[model samples]
Target: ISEFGSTMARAIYDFFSTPFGNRGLATNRTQLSSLLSSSNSPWQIVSTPEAPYPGSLMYQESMLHSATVPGVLGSRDAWRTFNVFGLSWTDEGLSGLVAAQDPPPAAPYQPASAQWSDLLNYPRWANRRRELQSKYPLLLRSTLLSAMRAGPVLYVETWPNMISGRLADWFMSQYGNNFVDMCARLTQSCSNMPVEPDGNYDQQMRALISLWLLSYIGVVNQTNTISGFYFSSKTRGQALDSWTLFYTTNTNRVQITQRHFAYVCARSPDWNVDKSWIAAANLTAIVMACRQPPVFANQGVINQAQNRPGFSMNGGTPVHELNLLTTAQECIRQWVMAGLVSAAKGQALTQEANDFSNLIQADLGQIKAQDDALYNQQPGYARRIKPFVNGDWTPGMTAQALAVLATFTA
Candidate 1:
């Protein structure tokens, strides 16, 4: 069974290295000619609105899983290639260019939808015009923010091949001023949000998550300098005022979110133990919180985010302290132990083990048999997964399972 798991992981590696994985423009072209369904086309790799829940936290989680496995397996190129432009504003950049263009002389020309168009054909949509700033400004801002957020990860993934300082400079100078304005907008929204008693709190959670993710990426990547490089005196003053209000509001929301999660966990009979993804995400949030230092809205104006209440595990003593690695190990342990217990109770066996043959008793043979059946299957070949409309397992899940194998074997 250990050998079988290794075999499955190798198959996954092979599948993603091919054009069927949609790693880049060249790979996309390789698969485009033969694929019959537009849904199956390689363009879907860049910006498919469907499946695994596009732009949702779940989507990001799945991508996080898929992207991590290759690194764990010593096949980092496989993951990096697939996500080469995962953080780029390539879609919005093209749209901005097209919307800035003059009306075509010979025929009526409608700009293609950014969601549906191939990024490789961006030049076809370009025309000389100045309206992009007034007409499609957010595209530029979103692009910059997206690029910044993705840059740090890419830098590490492609280590030893340094990110061009010139390219980095181009990004900061071109969009830096615009990003200050964007900061103002986001800050204002955070400030103005009213508490709703009946709200599901998803959007609020998303906002706070965005704040942490953005700040985490910036600080860790040393890209926070871009903010300073772009902010003019007028915009800088405005951004400072807005961010002060924004951070205070954000800090309040963090406590609220934590208390809310605690409430839900307390209410649940199983303590939401089955929600391993939530546990993982919250653990990540905690790690981000620890590593990200207090950055004031303006020069040297300090406002540290206040600590929240600790959550009680198993109705025992509450744990308040955080060490990134320790917390991560705890969560992973909880996930695995829960899976093992569930499998023993005649539930589906989903947990990863070092050696299924040695670890599982005869009663758990079904899981080994089921996994063996999928040894040669390649779901990532399609680079699509229907979360609601199908019974098929996902490449994302496959990657995660393999990640466990890689770590355990190592």
Candidate 2:
């Protein structure tokens, strides 16, 4: 709390001295997506010494694999050093640390994808990469390693940069399919990338890659995929009864989506689709929910599967208001509706406060704890593997990491 007290002092100084005074951040979708990219990257995985990276890391050449060793099992000295630089497992440092491991930790749960809806910083690649490295050991080493062996890997500053144009082109080059088909494709086409006979990191990467594509399709016109994905099936609004996008290995499990085909249900295209999708049983909902308004749909309610064959109407996906041309004017209408409560700027700030608070005070804390507890309780040894926060050992479930997250602002 002492470090947090210091952060408050900084916040207070900026509150009065910074331009716009009390005005909150003015961020667009691109900016928001940038944060998302960072949030999902390898940094967050190693945020706490207790939590394992969500996916198990693999080295094809060595023929070895290891899952994230949760709960304060990491080297305390490393955590202390990284924390001193204000880098925890949730920032850019963890990746650097992972890459620097000589033989790699038995099976590190390193992330292979960090797609986003926005840009976090400038100078694109050079700046972002440097920024991450400066703050985190893992990030620094990864950037350096990639440069030393720059055969096929290209690290861009922002997620959209690679996911949008040439990245998409490269995917097609290897997959030989458009974006939609590529998304639905069962087999991962990255030959150089090893495919797991069981639950593999390659499969995890495929899910993350699909989520990234959905983020892109949300903003840019889906010339290749469905326009309003929230309202339709994972198939881009294609008339389907239901589809299962879940997979896993003996060690790692991730359920991406499982929507019943629309036709299977008595009512085709039940706007509610399935609440389980929104519950984040499927990672797709989390990725889609992270978008801006219009594209963002309400977290649908959960209900028992109705008599419907595939349970489409049981919880159909509501249409994303932002995608409709008719609802274009509704944008102003929504502002007007909310304006009754406050001014435009005030309303926007209010929304941001709600979202930010939920992330730091609620979502981040919850995920960090779950990640940590799972790792720690996994038939492990002694000593709690907590993440270093603000240059100190902070328990994952306690208030330790909150202060570090408070510094995040646009």
Candidate 3:
């Protein structure tokens, strides 16, 4: 559930501030971890939908019932998927440090409005603006605009309900009719230092994942787009409606293929046209692609997944169902591969091999430990989910496995 460090800090802060302030950090960590896996389902009635046949929309579908009770739950979480660095913000700065990065504001034509626009109308914000202007009269519009128009800002806007189950509609066959308005408009690029305001608020690559999730349901760009392949009509059509963002039968095959390749490419340091910031740029590009959808060669797969339900099921666990798993796993593999091959004397991080090695091992350990629980519960889900899940699961990851074993024991 935690995205950025501050948010997690706040959640933890709030937990401690509660009546149980005496609980230690370790207790809080364990308690907070449970939130991620807590079943969010409210009470409901389970019923049979008119005998669903094979290939039917409702076939083998699960309905649930719940009673109001408070408890704890926990599950493995993907660190790579959630980290700001995972999406490419690290390299896009053009400058080496994260603080040096400056992303631009979204575009002028971005269609979606801000969820916090109402804040502009609030008297508190208005009064604060007046106070700031009076207190520091030299601040100018050009300065503000300049800052907003730089660096790696992405997917300009979002709906409040985006993270909800509605995302699951991506795998539903009729998604086109149910969820098309979710894509955020990317009207600008990165420009300013990765400062508090923009840096904290903007998610360059994570935006791509969210937008691709939208694209899966049919939100295609009819006109405005940075690149042609990402905004195809076919992609927009499938994102219109439905639930589940994983994989549906009518899922766009082209998009899926493209996503797989792009994922492969970004993780591969060899694919970087510009070698100076290969690791950083790939992260940036991946984030942008995720927000936009259709940046790679296979648009059809994405289009079909957007339109059809059960496409990811293709007789196995659904792709949409495995979104978080595959994205995190693949990103790590590709990143590590890039590091391994490019670790020659001339590479960017050649001198930092020990650090990079530790980082890579940590990533692998967390992903594997989490993945094991997932695979254990579902067994064939990993195998059946190969195209979406990381198809290559090594039995022995050597050093990385050792790290995981150490963590498990500790």
lDDT of 2 by residue, 1-410 (tens): 12111111000000000010011111112222222233334333232332222111101100110111111123433332232111234322333222223333333233211111111222232344433222222221222111111111111011112223433333434332233343333222322222221123222332334333232222111211211121112322212212222211222112222211000000111111222121111222111112111110112211221122221243333321111111112222333453322455434534443343334334334543663555445432211211212211122111211221112110
Give the residue spans of candidate 3 off by over 4 A: 1-348, 351-359, 374-410
Choose the strongest candidate by TM-score.
Answer: 2
lDDT of 3 by residue, 113-225 (tens): 10111212323324444332221101111111111111111122232222224323332422333222222122122222121221322342333343443232123222211
| Best model per lDDT | 2
Residue 393 Cα positional deviation in candidate 3, in Å, after optimal superposition: 9.2
Give the alpha-carbon lDDT of every model. Answer: 0.21, 0.23, 0.21
Give the TM-score of each candidate.
0.19, 0.20, 0.19
Candidate 1 deviant stretches above 4 angstroms: 1-50, 53-123, 129-381, 384-410
lDDT of 1 by residue, 1-410 (tens): 11211111000001011111122111111222232134321111123322221222222222322222222222212222222212111132222111111332222211111111111122222332232212112222121112111100100001111112553343343443333343333334433223121122222232232332222211211212221221111111011111111211111111111111101011111111112223224322222222111111111110111111121112321111121112222333333343422324311221222122123222123322433333225322222211111111112232232232122111
Q: RMSD for each model, in Å, please? A: 22.2, 22.4, 24.5
Cα error, candidate 1, residue 258 (Å) = 33
